[PDB]
Amino acid sequence: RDFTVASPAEFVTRFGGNKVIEKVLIANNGIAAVKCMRSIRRWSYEMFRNERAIRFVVMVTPEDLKANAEYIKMADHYVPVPGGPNNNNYANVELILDIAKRIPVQAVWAGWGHASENPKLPELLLKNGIAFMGPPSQAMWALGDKIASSIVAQTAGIPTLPWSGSGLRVDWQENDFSKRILNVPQELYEKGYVKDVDDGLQAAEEVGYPVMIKASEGGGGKGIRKVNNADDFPNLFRQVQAEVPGSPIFVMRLAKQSRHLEVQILADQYGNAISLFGRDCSVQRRHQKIIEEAPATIATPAVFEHMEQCAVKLAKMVGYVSAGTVEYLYSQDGSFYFLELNPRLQVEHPCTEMVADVNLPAAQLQIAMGIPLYRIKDIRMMYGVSPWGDSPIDFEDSAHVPCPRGHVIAARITSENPDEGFKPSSGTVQELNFRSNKNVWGYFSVAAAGGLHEFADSQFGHCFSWGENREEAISNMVVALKELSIRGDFRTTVEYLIKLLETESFQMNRIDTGWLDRLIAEKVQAERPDTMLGVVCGALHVADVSLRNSVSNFLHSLERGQVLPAHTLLNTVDVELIYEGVKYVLKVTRQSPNSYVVIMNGSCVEVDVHRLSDGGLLLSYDGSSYTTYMKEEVDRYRIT
Amino acid sequence: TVQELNFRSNKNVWGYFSVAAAGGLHEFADSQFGHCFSWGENREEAISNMVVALKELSIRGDFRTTVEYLIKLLETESFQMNRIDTGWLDRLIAEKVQAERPDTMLGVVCGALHVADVSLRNSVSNFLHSLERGQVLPAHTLLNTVDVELIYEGVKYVLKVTRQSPNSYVVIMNGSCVEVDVHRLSDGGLLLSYDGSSYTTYMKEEVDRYRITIGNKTCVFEKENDPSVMRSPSAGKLIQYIVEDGGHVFAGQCYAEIEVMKMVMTLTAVESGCIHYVKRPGAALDPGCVLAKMQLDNPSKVQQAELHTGSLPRIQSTALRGEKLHRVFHYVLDNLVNVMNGYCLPDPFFSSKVKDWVERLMKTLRDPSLPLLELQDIMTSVSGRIPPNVEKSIKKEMAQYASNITSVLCQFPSQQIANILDSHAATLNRKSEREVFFMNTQSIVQLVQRYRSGIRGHMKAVVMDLLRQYLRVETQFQNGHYDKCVFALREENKSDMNTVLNYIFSHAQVTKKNLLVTMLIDQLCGRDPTLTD
């Protein structure tokens, strides 16, 4: 408790780094930018007693400015860039370099946006003396496409693979650095890629019926064919060969319906790599993550520790720094398969922060300054060592010391529309109120003022809940989701998440990567109010708008000296509403300014209605009170 | 009332409030409208979490909101060392510890910008509304310069605010200017860029004060109403005074009779004191003019002037001095275009920078390296969706052009780039391989079209286009008086009144524009007595 730092220079000196970072460029937007700035600023206050010791520069398009993106106000400096698709603003590595040198910055963070999948950016930055908070390009190359990934995984402790073209491997390089030279593995590439019509069949004979054939440039709905038969392989195979003519094609075995696990790997620039903890990410819709859970509770200790060891060995031999994820496919009988390494920080990384008491983006910053792992505070605590010291950590001997604290659920809030599929929606926000509580938090890339524009991706917010175990975390998440209010022009998938968390299959942890797909085809978009209440509420909203407009227009006429007759100031409104094919016709009148009467087929009900300052109505109907809102569309009424 | 309530929660921090963004606090509604909580492993971590969280929240409304004081307390060493007692805060209160103020210079600039922006937007709105109704106001009620006066800690600051563009503001004090980049936010605030640093700011106008929020710090400026000078609220004429010169008047008593509108309006005194009249009975009145002084007992606010006479901070400039040369093109050209649209500095500042803009543009347009730099940017931004054949050819051609710089036979290969692209289009891939090529190559097409005749033709084209801007406006205000010309424009542009306003606004600064016109003629048709058609 004798450390006295005020500037990053002194910190680097004391902790044994070699590069000072005072300015960081964020080549990202939305959630990533928000999260980076916030986490690092917390750490900055912790060490320097100055929340703004590290300045953050952001690149702003006119779209994000007009939409009042949240990260803009947080940033220290902004520079405008050209708008439009990602290749003009954020995926343009040369532009990133141009800004990084125009505004003298010492580092560039990319995160999980659009440039962190381009191996050319670390080269461009390192050639100019700029520290990239991520892997070097040589790793990202060695971690290239899929054939090279499957091959290189087998050079050290061999993870099982579902015949990535075949099960053949290369020589042993347990802890040596190597590049993907096409001299030895070329044979594997020749087996991993196919040329003739009958080349692919040689895989089908060994893998079995569920064969997946994809072009080297396949994706986006084309270049992919799933063969379910044995004799129909030539048809869809030749189809893939025609989907991307001239390009090499590859054949692989299709996955079974099982679990998708992840391991979070963190590493310094001195060859030390550690496994933090895992994640269970098996709630997916069309291969898109929806809900993530931090303790990988499905895997037993033995097999899970094995998966951790394999992930670390890969990171060490390939030469990966800062942070990344290794994906595994976990079968129900205790057998894992390698899938791929993601060379960048994931959006769902707080899941492992919350159970490890670490800060990953700050750790990336400290790594970028050249600080080894045994001098970073949180790591030192994680292995049971005094934070204020410099003693080394034997990471292999003390690898049993780290232990997760609790259980975390992360639910992402998307902008899709569960009604009629999952079409992405967009528009303005009218209210964004997330009521936090003990062990619950969350954050969003947009505020109440502002919106989501055409080029603004989905996933505009993330909620997290902690508990001692699975059940408590579920409970916290469900309640918190039921308590938040999001209102706007766009649609906001929240209610569907609630319905999923209340489903017994989830709560008993009996799910797989095809769970949600099956549920979608079964038409599970429930969580509707009772019909009678909805009819009454919609009637009241329509009638109240009509009555208020009548009053406003009539009074305006009176102010101007015109007299309208006393039948344009009506107190009765006819409302018609169709629900599930059934037409309802109602009359709405009033016995007082606040007492409304809804009449249908000669029967009447009384409702106490009060106008709220926020545009909604407070109802008292049958004892129970309700808060309601309406939005009128071209051909629909949306009643909340 | 509440205007915004955003508590950014985080790990180990939460809180809750009894009121939402819509809603408010009424008379019988007690204090303590919300609570924040922070957890940590020990005392220090908990403090850190609380401090950061408090610095990140945003509460805005009519009421005042004690948060900054809590921050100051948590950052006090006596708290952190846990050396406090039940009388700690009382002692600190008596020591006048209400700190956490922004720097004065920044606060002055920000308040100036808010005041001026409100005045400018009101001018625009009222003028445009008049145009919609068929009224024509003269072109001195649509001003681009605002005078702002702000008192801070007894010191009076007097500033002028103008604009060089819709987003570029200039604050002038005592002959020194600073440039600020201002963007309007949808939430009512302003985004500033001042000296590199960016700021988010908000303003609330009170009866006699301006409340300026900069980030999470608050600064309050006093609106001068202290000298106790009676002033005419409007234009008009003075008819008579009601009371004797030197007589005592009481607040609420009428002291003078004036007439504007051919309709008589009296004038009540604000304060009780001895009145002496400045204007003699029968006189022209201007709004805010000096009519009559009153002697009071001077309770306070004596000599709250000490007019600041210095200079505002000036480190940066954003002039792109030696930065890439093709960005400088855009910079200077856009400044000159905005001059042509009526955005012009005041007297001693105009033509002190415009001449430099012209000179820098002329140098840039004669540099052979400009078009290839443009090509670099547009080609690099689109790596994918371009056939490799055309990509390789273009890279080769531009490399050749670079090799021939500084040679009398050096010409930009616009035709050759166009040739290879048209060759690929002559192959004409069908069905989504057609349109992708024609669309992802549009930037290149634009570039080559601009430089069909080389840098010479491009230079002449740019300067000509500016001259055309001039004529586009000034040929409409010939043939008669101001209002007649405006009515002609109104009757042509029936469906849009912003166009009409733009014509008027740019016409207002005709003299400064003419200076620029002459400078652009002399640099084009000077020592080269030839004229193309």
From Swiss-Prot, chain A:
The active site is at residue 344. The modification Phosphothreonine is found at residue 513. The biotin cofactor is covalently attached to the central biotinyl-binding domain and is required for the catalytic activity. The modification Phosphoserine is found at residue 391. ATP binds at residues 218-223. Mn(2+) 2 binds at residues 340, 342. Mn(2+) 1 binds at residues 327, 340. Consists of an N-terminal biotin carboxylation/carboxylase (BC) domain that catalyzes the ATP-dependent transient carboxylation of the biotin covalently attached to the central biotinyl-binding/biotin carboxyl carrier (BCC) domain. The C-terminal carboxyl transferase (CT) domain catalyzes the transfer of the carboxyl group from carboxylated biotin to acetyl-CoA to produce malonyl-CoA. This is Acetyl-CoA carboxylase 1. It comes from Homo sapiens (Human). The chain holds residues 98 to 737 of 2346 of the full protein.
